[PDB]
Structure 1
Amino acid sequence: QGPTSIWTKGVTPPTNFIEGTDGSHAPYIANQGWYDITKTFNGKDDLLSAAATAGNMLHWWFDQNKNQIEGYLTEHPEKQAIIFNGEQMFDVKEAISTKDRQLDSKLFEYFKEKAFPTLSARRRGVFPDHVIDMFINGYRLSLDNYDKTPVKEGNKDLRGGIFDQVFTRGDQSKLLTNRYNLRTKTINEISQLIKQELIAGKALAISHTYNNIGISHVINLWGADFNSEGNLEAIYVTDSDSNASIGMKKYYVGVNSAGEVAVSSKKIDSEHLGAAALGLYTLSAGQGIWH
């Protein structure tokens, strides 16, 4: 009969929550284990919600794997930088140094400027698991694939494969990502999945319907509140579309009038149907796998 709460491994719950114009938010504080990559809307990042979300999860991943990554980069120093012909496009140490920045992290800068510079202009986006599977394992990110990454040997995507000397292509046990359909699932099914993935020590992203830019939006899910019945009541999220001053938002979770498990900055109501939950993406730290 008590309302229990569960946070992502290595994240300090914010407590600075203030009433805003639409719902409760906790402005971002550095070095608390969560991340809030924020779009500038510069032409290039406008439709990269998924790449921002993947970036936030990769920032979290850098924290989980700090020692393992510094070990790896000494054993394989050629994997530190990415070069296209003559030019250094990316340096992973630069990404790690700048991981605390909402607006000007080198990781999101790489994504919007070098990896996916044309996708926004072409009214196109990505899936956050594809971005991670590219960045870590070197799996080729295809604009034609709307399902999971095909787990098969193949050429390193030139835009990534930094950790592909440990997290190889075509080996299921070295795949760190997963995705789950939430559409038409019950509050109990969605709640147990999110519970399980959080207690398992995964980073989480959730997609919901969007009544604007695209049709779906993906955000980072850092924490959840579960009621007396074990069902989600609220989630704590960062949203790349929210300006840098917002930070962590509290969304109510419930079953709306239309029978959808929905998220809303306001309590689910006869007057507030929120946005339908569509998908869940997870990232493992992969701590079994190093060495």
Structure 2
Amino acid sequence: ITSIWTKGVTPPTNFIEGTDGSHAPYIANQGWYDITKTFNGKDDLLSAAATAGNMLHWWFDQNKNQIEGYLTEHPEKQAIIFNGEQMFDVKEAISTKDRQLDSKLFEYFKEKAFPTLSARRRGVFPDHVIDMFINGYRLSLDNYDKTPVKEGNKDLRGGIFDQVFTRGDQSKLLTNRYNLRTKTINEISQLIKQELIAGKALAISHTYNNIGISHVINLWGADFNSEGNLEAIYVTDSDSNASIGMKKYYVGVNSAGEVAVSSKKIDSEHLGAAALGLYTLSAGQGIWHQTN
């Protein structure tokens, strides 16, 4: 009965029943993004990096003018260039943020940043990715905690906007994570609601079919009932093909008593996918104006 959506995101309305479930096809310039995998081998396990990408594309919206100003003053930072390669151009990503399959940012992530990750059966965490790209924090594949906030070497695969968003300053770290596995429906519900009303972009993780790596999706919207508990969430999915777009997931407490999500209602025949983690991204619009 009450629905809340991410700052800068116009709610889709074109919801139809699909093979997965209720989905509204993607349309560009609506605030939300749907980076999707080509399953070319290099990106088969990068759902977190696609999720991260989505939130970055949203970040590029919320800070457009701020960004283009920064880049004309910091042209050096415009490209990612080491080893004698030109690995990435940030201006290309912004030009192509609206594209789903061929988005020049996701192209960077799968082809240059984490190419060998899927063959190694390893993934990343969305926050780690964003913290690498923006602040230039070195990403570890074996880090199961938040990014260590300390002054450190720039990750060569990131730090585009690290002349503003520095390392070793809590004020400059834009991301946040919460373990959902230790919480019940009530606490998770309110937790999503606060972060969403606080104009943050949301990414949720859950158990997939792979035993090593969790799946991660973008949480754009959320429906809450009388009680203030999550009734349903609206998400994009890297693994879902481009024709799907915004999916409606039901949220409930399963037989096992874990909070879970699925394309269909949670029942006894439908255990759902248990929610593992929540990752948030602030737009950091105020950050550009707090340095002295």
TM-score range, shorter chain: over 0.9
> Structure 1 residue 213: deviation in Å?
6.9
Report if aligned partners of 2:202, 2:220 keep a CA contact under 8 Å in 1.
yes
Per-residue deviation at 1:215?
4.6
Using the alignment, how far apart are the partners of 2:200 and 2:236 within structure 1? 16
Structure 1 pair 231/178, CA: closer, same or farther in 2 (3 Å)? same
What does residue range 89-238 of structure 1 map to in structure 2 within 5 Å?
Answer: 89-212=87-210, 214-238=212-236
By how many angstroms is 1:85 displaced?
2.6
Distance 1:175 1:95, change over 3 A: same
1:76 Cα offset (Å): 1.1
Secondary structure of the residue aligned to 1:136 is helix
Q: After superposition, give the CA deviation of every residue in 1:63-116 in whole Å (9 maximum; x if it has no partner).
A: 000000011111211110111132211110100000000000000000001111
Provide structure 1 residue ranges, at least 5 long, that are not aligned to the other structure.
none
User: What's 1:56 paired with?
Assistant: 54
Separation (CA, whole Å) in 1 of partners of 2:174 and 2:182 = 26
Q: What corresponds to 2:12 in structure 1?
A: 14
User: Following superposition, which runs of at least 4 residues in structure 1 exceed 3 angstroms of deviation?
Assistant: 212-215
Shift of 1:224: 0.1
Query: Any idea what the Cα deviations from partners look like across 1:182-224, whole Å, max 9, x if unmatched?
Result: 0031111000100000000000000011134755200000000
The number of equivalent residue pairs is 288
- Evaluate the alpha carbon distance shift between residue 51 and residue 215 of structure 1 in structure 2; reply closer, same or farther with a 3 A threshold: closer
Distance in 2 (CA, whole Å) between partners of 1:213 and 1:49 is: 15
Structure 2 gap ranges (5+): none
State how far apart, in whole Å, the 1-side matches of 2:243 and 2:159 are.
33
Distance 1:211 1:123 in 2: 13
Mapped partners of 1:241, 1:22: distance in 2: 12
Alpha-carbon shift at residue 23 of structure 1 (Å): 1.1
Q: Pick which of 58-67 and 141-150 moved more.
A: 141-150
Structural RMSD (CA): 1.0
Deviation of 1:144 after TM superposition, in Å, equals 2.2
Looking at structure 2, the residues matched to 56 and 35 of structure 1 have their Cα atoms a distance apart, in angstroms, of 5
Aligned counterparts of 1:50 and 1:139: Cα–Cα separation in 2: 17
> Match of 2:221, SS?
strand
- State the Cα deviation string for residues 34-84 of structure 1 (Å, max 9, x = none): 000000011100000010000000000000000000111112111101111
> Hey, what does 2:31 align to over in structure 1?
33
Q: Bigger shift: 4-13 or 19-28?
A: 19-28
Kept after mapping to 1: 8 A contact 2:122/2:213: no
Cα distance in 2 for partners of 1:209, 1:142 equals 21
Q: Identity across aligned pairs (percent)?
A: 100
Structure-2 separation of matches of 1:17 and 1:212: 29
Q: Which moved more, 1:29-38 or 1:80-89?
A: 80-89
Q: How far apart are the structure 2 equivalents of 1:226 and 1:193? A: 12
Report the Cα offset of residue 26 of structure 1: 0.6
Q: Give the conservation status (yes or no) of the 8 Å contact 2:123–2:213.
A: no
Closer, same or farther in 2 for the Cα pair 1:150/1:212, shift >3 Å?
A: closer
- Cα distance between partner residues in 1 of 2:266 and 2:178: 23
